[PDB]
Amino acid sequence: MREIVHIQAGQCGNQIGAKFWEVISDEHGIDPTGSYHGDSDLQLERINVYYNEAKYVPRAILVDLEPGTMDSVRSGPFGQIFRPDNFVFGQSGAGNNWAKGHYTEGAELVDSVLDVVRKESESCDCLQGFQLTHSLGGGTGSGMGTLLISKIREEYPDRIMNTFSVMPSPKVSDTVVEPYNATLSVHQLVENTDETYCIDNEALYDICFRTLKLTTPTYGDLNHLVSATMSGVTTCLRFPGQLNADLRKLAVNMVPFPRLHFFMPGFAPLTSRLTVPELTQQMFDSKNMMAACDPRHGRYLTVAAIFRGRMSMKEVDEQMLNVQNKNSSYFVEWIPNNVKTAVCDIPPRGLKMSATFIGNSTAIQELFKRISEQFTAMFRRKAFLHWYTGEGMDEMEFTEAESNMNDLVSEYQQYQDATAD
Amino acid sequence: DLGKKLLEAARAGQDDEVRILMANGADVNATDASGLTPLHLAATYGHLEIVEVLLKHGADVNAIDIMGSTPLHLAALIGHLEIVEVLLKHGADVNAVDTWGDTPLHLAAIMGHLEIVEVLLKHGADVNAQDKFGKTAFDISIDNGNEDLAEILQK
Amino acid sequence: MRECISIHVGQAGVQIGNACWELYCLEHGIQPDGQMPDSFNTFFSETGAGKHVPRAVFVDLEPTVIDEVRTGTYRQLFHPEQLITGKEDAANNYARGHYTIGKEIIDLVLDRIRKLADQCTGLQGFLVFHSFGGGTGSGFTSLLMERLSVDYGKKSKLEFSIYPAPQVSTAVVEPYNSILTTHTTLEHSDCAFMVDNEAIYDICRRNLDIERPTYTNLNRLISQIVSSITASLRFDGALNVDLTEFQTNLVPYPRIHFPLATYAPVISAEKAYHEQLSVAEITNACFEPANQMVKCDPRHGKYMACCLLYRGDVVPKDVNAAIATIKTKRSIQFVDWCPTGFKVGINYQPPTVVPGGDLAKVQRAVCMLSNTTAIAEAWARLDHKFDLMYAKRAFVHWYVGEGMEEGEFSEAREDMAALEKDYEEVGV
Ligand SMILES: Nc1nc2c(ncn2[C@@H]2O[C@H](COP(=O)(O)OP(=O)(O)OP(=O)(O)O)[C@@H](O)[C@H]2O)c(=O)[nH]1
Ligand SMILES: Nc1nc2c(ncn2[C@@H]2O[C@H](COP(=O)(O)OP(=O)(O)O)[C@@H](O)[C@H]2O)c(=O)[nH]1
Ligand SMILES: [Mg+2]
Structure with a gap:
């Protein structure tokens, strides 16, 4: 289990993807030309996980139906680090239409993308699997991203499929077709991914506005929270360790039921562009969650907590046992020892102390119900269905997508009310 | 049939075709198979100038389709603020109730159209109106954790 | 000889194996390259050039742990072909270890074991080291044990099994792996010594004053106990002279084959001038729960066998007097169908401690092996x-x-x- 192949699709996928590469490159001492200029041996030990050694080159494929995003990424600080042949771009975008992404424009580009994936996978010694960054609210990332997921799963069934999926909110974009796009996508994520990090624009906006007191949050403000989260949740894959060291061991510890693989990430401290008990309480606080759900409204099936920086392990162990013993009623009693803790010595950029939380909580049903209520409000009035049905799609796909997401909500509620007895 | 052509021109935002069709006797209150009128379609698709033209020439501002949707429900659902305002200026029933028990306030609340919610409340939207599941717009805001909306709904 | 082959499976099995062979080398005067300026021939072959090589196999489904053996202090001790690795581990999944990943290396592992077995004139059998919780330690061990039962029908198989503790666990599913491996290995194992990581953790904290024990700390303590159990095999002892005798002395029935190990005294290396404990004192310490390798309460259960393995400056008459005192204690009840007694082994060499270790050198030590229902x-x-x-x-x-x-x-x-x-x- 060594190489991960990263795919970034659509505007959001590429923007959060570019930030992910900038952040982990600085952590691993890789400069914008691929040269290593760090001063720690731990930085290079597991560099093969995300980088090909040419000089280090990201094992990243950049996809979009809109060419403008090629230039945007290339113009960025680490833009020239990516392999030029790994940029697979179309001419006519998807216009926020899932059907254009999944069936028409996206279907025409998908084979050129799979050719590049194949080339990157055949060069891997022991391919762990795939990491996809995308939004669910648009057309490319959602429609073409889920098409790519389906085609990769059929060609690489033995590999782990992991996504960083950004959920739409009226607070950030407010284009009323986003609930359709997102519902049609969750349908695909439930069946074809092993693990999904739910990055909710509702939560990112609320953190920026209410906690960080940013009057008008930008995508840069939201993406600062996303990049800190992506760095945090991939620490165990990128540095030596014994807990959740690869995608499969992470899945086996975090996923008790195959469809309930949507994680609520959290991070402390929250900052705009700290002791061990503070890190521990903030990590578990609703205000620090990247999914707009209150964990105290459900129960934790499983949890992974990653602490970063120089700190007392006996203090981390005491504070972690304290939260479970104090708040016993929020962790399912029928999954014994369901909270696992890691500590990485290397801290993130600009901080001495940090903590990342990955929860598989039944409270994530609040996110799915919010999307479902918006989907249903729109679908009941059949608003703009023609835009989808005229792009190689059927109306029954809407009813099946609605039904699959409400069954997902029902499954979470089943385990929230379950008792050991 | 000019009725079908007017319905399509109102939906497509074809201002000059709406004008020519009306000049040839097109029924301003024509209905499609589901009971939607040119005003419902212009309101749904955000065509403010066509909304105004239809209302100046006898369009029923409170017409209902088969599901009980009025143009105001659809402008509130889609989030067309200026259209909501024109419709209310022309006598739109702020508390019209569709077949799901929804009022324009419920739809603007669900979709997070906060400015529209404020206008509807200013024009007398019923905070006690319950949908078929017993939920008011305030219940929707509490149940979905929308704190900005819950504050707005409480003024 | 009457050779014994040691097999180390998965991370825990390999790392405990490293600590055991390190200790055995020191106990027998063997250098990390196999040279020395014999009883231990049961555990080491001898090459033409005077090199003493462990009769040991190390197997893991990923290479990280075995790569450390291949580049560390003991890089030249083992036969390089007896350090075997796959690329992709069992992901804490018994099924991957036993079925989908384990089936890719099982034939290589058996062919490499056969090479060791062909150098034996009277192979007694196997000592198998593994965790219960890991995918490899659980699933690959059970696959290997099934295959060794078919391929070596008359040979004894003994296990050293690491029982999971939440303090150092890396997987939520370790109880599943534990039960699956126990079920599938039960018919193929003659005697199994379980080591509860929580018991070892507590000993490190309470006796060795180590606030946060590492696997290196746990493993050097475990190796001391394993050495006490295997010393009879390596020093031509009068008790437990061969693998078959572990079964005769500790296992009255094939299935209830899990003896409890209790070891004393465990003293911190910082206490270099501690007053030495007598045979009576260390023997009394065998009935104190704090010294057990598995957390349980023998005072509530019943004994089916009990054997006392002494090391160091131990006079037989002092052992006999200490046993007579123990026999007059209301809390030690034997089943009515077993002889109500205690078998004794004495090894007169001083107990050895490793440089880098946490234990003080002691003049006398004891390991009690008791088959208790507790x-x-x-x-x-x-x-x-x-x-x-x-x-x-x-x-x-x-x-x-x-x-x-x-x-x-x-x-x-x-x-x-x-x-x-x-x-x-x-x-x-
Ligand atoms: N005492 C001790 N326990 C260990 C050691 N390494 C791991 N463990 C324990 O073994 C269990 C985990 O199994 P491992 O041996 O690491 O796993 P594995 O056999 O390599 O299997 P996979 O990695 O799943 O392929 C847990 O209960 C750990 O606490 C060690 O060196 N000493
Ligand atoms: N957090 C975040 N959300 C974004 C970003 N760019 C777009 N989005 C969201 O993504 C959705 C629109 O999809 P987008 O990626 O632009 O369309 P696509 O190019 O067709 O995949 C909406 O929910 C936007 O709010 C970004 O940089 N960060
Ligand atoms: Mg392992």
């Missing part, structure tokens, strides 16, 4: 965690998708339920 409490704890998850079928999909049928969970659990009844029937 160890059933360790099975009951594992079975309870298994039942909580299995009732909701939590994590079962990971196993069914890796070459295992769902029916194997309930078959393994009912065999554990039959094991709990076996203990309850032997002593009440």
